[PDB]
Design a protein around this ligand. Sequence first.
Ligand SMILES: Nc1ncnc2c1ncn2[C@@H]1O[C@H](COP(=O)(O)OP(=O)(O)OC[C@H]2O[C@@H](O)[C@H](O)[C@@H]2O)[C@@H](O)[C@H]1O
Length: 167
Amino acid sequence: SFSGYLKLTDNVYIKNADIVEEAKKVKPTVVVNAANVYLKHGGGVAGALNKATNNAMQVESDDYIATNGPLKVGGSCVLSGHNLAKHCLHVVGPNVNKGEDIQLLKSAYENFNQHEVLLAPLLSAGIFGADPIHSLRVCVDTVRTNVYLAVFDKNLYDKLVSSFLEM
Ligand SMILES: Nc1ncnc2c1ncn2[C@@H]1O[C@H](COP(=O)(O)OP(=O)(O)OC[C@H]2O[C@@H](O)[C@H](O)[C@@H]2O)[C@@H](O)[C@H]1O
């Protein structure tokens, strides 16, 4: 039950909001975590989602990692959403602070296309060091399902929208 979003394209929507609070008001089927390949949930969206599950995401993640080994950059896995959503799509964007290839951002957003509807942040745009505006551009050009983007910083939201109008 997404409310209050700005329509950017027929399938990309954006709202100035914290992703953990949206998950609670909207009860989404798929919340996207911006993850790293070991599902070690640090200080961004991944930390906040984990906090709200009372660390259940981290245990489940380690269990997944123990069985299956780490993800590839640009990949994903479908774990549980616990009290936030039905499912959590863990997606690993490139970490440009660690020399990974920004082109893999396209591979990262392609995982979204296996889900009809998702609530997501902007992959790689915080701790991983990609430009938010670039991340939004790849999102817009790669994702074909319905993606609802949560941008918690009001100034970044304004910047992002203004950047998108250079269409
Ligand atoms: N609670 C939040 N709600 C909405 N957007 C948020 C929130 N916290 C951060 N963001 C925004 O989401 C985008 C992604 O930030 P990160 O979560 O740091 O994502 P990423 O750059 O992919 O970092 C991946 C890394 O962060 C760790 O938490 C994670 O375990 C991995 O090591 C950025 O614009 C950031 O400002």
